Amino acid sequence: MDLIGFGYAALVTFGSIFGYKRRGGVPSLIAGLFVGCLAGYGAYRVSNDKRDVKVSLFTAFFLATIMGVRFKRSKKIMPAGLVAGLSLMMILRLVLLLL
Prior knowledge:
Family: Belongs to the TMEM14 family.
CATH architecture of the largest domain: Orthogonal Bundle
Membrane topology: Multi-pass membrane protein
Radius of gyration: 18 Å
Subcellular location: Mitochondrion membrane; Endoplasmic reticulum membrane
Protein name: Transmembrane protein 14A
CATH class of the largest domain: Mainly Alpha
CATH topology of the largest domain: Arc Repressor Mutant, subunit A
Function: Inhibits apoptosis via negative regulation of the mitochondrial outer membrane permeabilization involved in apoptotic signaling pathway.
Helix content: 55-70%
């Protein structure tokens, strides 16, 4: 008759969260890479309407509204990364603009 049981699931959950990348938001740079991660990870098969920067902005706006980049209480911390990301994206792509 196992005793622990929970402990196992406990540590499991611990390593689970720890492992999985963090959500972020507070930072900006991280918010940028993220937005870009979606831009790509998505673009993978995002194909359909043949978008381009639509995802960039649309995203920045999405995540923005998600976290709270929009007009709110903050010292330009949480936000910035969002938009800054959208740009770093359209640019990170405009670089090759071949794919």
